[PDB]
Amino acid sequence: GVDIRHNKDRKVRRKEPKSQDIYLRLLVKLYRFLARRTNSTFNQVVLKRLFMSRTNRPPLSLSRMIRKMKLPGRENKTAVVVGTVTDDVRVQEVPKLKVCALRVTSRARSRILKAGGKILTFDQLALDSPKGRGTVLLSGPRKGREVYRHFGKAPGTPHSHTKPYVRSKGRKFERARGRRASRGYKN
Amino acid sequence: APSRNGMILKPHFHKDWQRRVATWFNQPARKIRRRKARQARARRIAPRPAAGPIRPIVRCPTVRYHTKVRAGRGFSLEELRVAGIHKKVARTIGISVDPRRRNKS
Amino acid sequence: LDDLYGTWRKAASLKSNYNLPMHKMLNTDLSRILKSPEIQRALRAPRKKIH
Amino acid sequence: PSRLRKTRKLRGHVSHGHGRIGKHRKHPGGRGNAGGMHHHRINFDKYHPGYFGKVGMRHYHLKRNQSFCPTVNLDKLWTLVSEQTRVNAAKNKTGAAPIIDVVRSGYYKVLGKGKLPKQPVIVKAKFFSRRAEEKIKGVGGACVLVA
Amino acid sequence: AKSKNHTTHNQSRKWHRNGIKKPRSQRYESLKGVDPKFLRNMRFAKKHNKKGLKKMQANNAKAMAARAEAIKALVVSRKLHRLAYIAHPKLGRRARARIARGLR
RNA sequence: GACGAGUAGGAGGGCCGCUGCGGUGAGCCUUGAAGCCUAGGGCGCGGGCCCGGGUGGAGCCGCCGCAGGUGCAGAUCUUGG
């Protein structure tokens, strides 16, 4: 035989979206063609993020893209987000933007158009730029989900700040024994 | 035998809850019954308002809701006597009256 | 129908707050998109020689 | 639906996905949270610290309305009033400042967290944080207390 | 009802199945557990680093000028080798052109 | 191109199987449906399936989705023979 172990002989990476959305699959077909027939890896990254699930493409806020496009050098570029561009209310002045996203909320798009921006989908983004030249690829905070507060080193352990699963935060709920140096021990 | 990580739960199912359980399979039927009784009442009092008598302006007691104004139980006797409306005729003409309401304002 | 479900630029006049859902893509004609000079120009040479 | 559940593919396997050495008995570890102090000590200490014991004082008749006091931040402070208020105040030449009655919106306490735009305001609230008030004073404005 | 007490037979195989990986060393190790007085000194130094900026900028400018003027002041067998030179695409183009003309 | 073992266990594909529901086949059917038998012709690795012959006389199936009281060799299993 062979001295080969098959623990990791199969890659776990995706090859297609797990959704039956026909519009998404049509965009997948377009970028599949672009990725396999162009030398630019931007299409390949967009194709990967298209394959990714809902939680792997968190909704990028308006504030993040404003701060990231405000960086010097990337003037009048094309901000491309594979996820969703959501309105952020803690901002007053919105500069002119070049936004390419799968979907934008009803008032965020109104705010950008009022500010003088332009929202274009991926089908017209391909026509504007096949290889994605003159574009900045942005992603939302993937660790921003509240579930990540519960992950990592276990709670009730020294040097471990992990949120415990408590049915109701309060005085009587998981506060006495493992949390205090008086009632036994504290970590 | 709790699992690795998760909440601690105290469900209140240790009694014989199946013996006393109420199901809402009659919810639409009860809605229709209320609607028919309401319409029958409305046509019974042909010119009178469907909602009934008139209730006064009232703001909620607690601190959480002292900035909101709701509907009252009835008009106070002091308010009625200022308005010159008798306590026995107010209900006849369709004015809600409850003698327990005070007026500290 | 327009007063019921609203136009793209005019919201529904009979619903409290509703508007037509925005398209994920506008130009759905994939063949027309692919067979355009803009995309075909920025492409690599095909390799249809089976080995 | 039961069509897609694992039990449909467990037919033909004797143990039905529960093991052959240690059978799926009824309650091998007691009922519910049994033995948290005795044989589940490791789990209840590695995942539920502070679970055992009392702490603090006891408030017998607790009413939430007395302690009801929602809070808002200065970044969302302008969101309460309409956009045309802010643009007209910015365009205004006589120096008149808009009055924001946060109580009418439904917030009693104002906390100063975000950046406040350079524009005079009159915040009429029930409570103020020290940093919130100093930010309003620094940006130029007034604070009005109401009961 | 006796039974064996302790065993460490298959443990090594269990460990090496996933590999006994060393901890992943990472640059800029944390500063926990150091002498508090030394830690206070370091934090004060990082706190007051800002004021000594203009002198640092001037020294950097002088050094850059010094290096700028410094750089301104400074500024097998032969038959096989021949055939390899001809066979090379870029440097053998003229040789291949001449031998093509030689065939004609 | 490389590889192919497997208990407990996990995952995926089932144009594998049963019952009913919403759509669909100008579907089938007293010029014969279901069921049953068959030394018949086959297909699919396999779950199983399609035709041929005999009884039957009144209902039956394929595809797309939905739902489950949905698959037996045992349990000193239950009932009947």
Place this chain on the structure above:
RNA sequence: CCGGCUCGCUGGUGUGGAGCCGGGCGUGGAAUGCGAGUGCCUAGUGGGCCACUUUUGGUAAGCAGAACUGGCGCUGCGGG
């Protein structure tokens, strides 16, 4: 390695040390082989046994108890 700052710590001594910036050096500094790293949910398990060599109790045991490695368990096949 080369310069320049910061320090409320320690000091004869711009001493000591640490931190922070700027500049330069690619023959990528043993062999061999291999794509790696990282995060969640989780079944089953938690009675073992045998063999070379090391070895404890017992005279000895197809005995009882340990260490490394490999197997049976979970495994068919050729030989005994």
Place this chain on the structure above:
RNA sequence: AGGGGCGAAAGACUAAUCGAACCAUCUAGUAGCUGGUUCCCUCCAAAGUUUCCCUCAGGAUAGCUGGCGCUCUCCGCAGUU
């Protein structure tokens, strides 16, 4: 008349049931203990070991396992020397 009756006393008899009768209900009482646990194919693939428990026929917790992925490439890692 049942935790009662009766017993020249054997825990004897109390409707073939007596060291606590019979019937119905609570009750589908609990079981860390036995028995069984229903169609196919493909892929991956174990442990009987650490610690704690009135713990020793069991659990919790590490370890072993599988699934889902994700961040990068065409520097890193190693049951080796």
Place this chain on the structure above:
RNA sequence: CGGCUACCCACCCGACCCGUCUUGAAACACGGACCAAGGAGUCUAACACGUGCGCGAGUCGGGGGCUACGAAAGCCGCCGUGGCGCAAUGAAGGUGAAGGCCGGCGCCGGCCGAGGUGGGAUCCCGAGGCCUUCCAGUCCGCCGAGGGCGCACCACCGGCCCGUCUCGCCCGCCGCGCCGGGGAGGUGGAGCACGAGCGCACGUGUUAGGACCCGAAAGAUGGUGAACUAUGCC
């Protein structure tokens, strides 16, 4: 004449009866005469994780109301009351989430304004070059030494918020008080540091429920028996 396959027979090799417990099963281990039909992880609720859809710092009409299939479906918005999220910390009184620079006398006016480092997919610039006779030569592209602004994310250094400890000097007044506020340096927190949640559906895991199916020795409540028998009496 062909038909491997499905019927029977003959021969050669192999070939212990299944299930289950067990380290070890063909076992002198237990269940099993045969056949047909039924038959065992389902449902409710809670939580967690992952995936699909809608909306998005909002989200949800689940309760109520208005208008054969239809007990459906649509609508309410001054029916979003309310749940979850948007703020945490403290037992509580409560508090509650950047700063730097300039001029005048700790205070006043103006300016810059919402962290830094290392690694960072992608993007931007371009020392030159990609030939059809050769030279200069432009336009559209393509590759590329090197240099950048650096997604997400990881690690570290910072900063801010609440409780606490120490050293402290100031500031304010309607009631100058056992008043209130502010700094620096350590420390504890399920925190902030330019959102990511809400609703519905699916799968998995755990739990309380009869809870995968069958199984006790027992306990309690209410009633029926001296037609056998035990004993007393007539």
Place this chain on the structure above:
RNA sequence: GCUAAAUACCGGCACGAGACCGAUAGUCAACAAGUACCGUAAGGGAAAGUUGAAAAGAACUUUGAAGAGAGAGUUCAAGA
């Protein structure tokens, strides 16, 4: 001390419906079912549906005492 309304309903009367069950299922009971049957009693408690469209339920002959056959006849079909 009285008082309708909105509220509860697995008993009862009369109704409508079902992504339910289809005679070992579904109520114990689709039928002369709480009937037969067992226990002194309290109580326990079943099995059991399908001729044919219409009985047109097989005239009449023949062996046997008859059960029951052999012909004949009814029916599309007694292979009902």
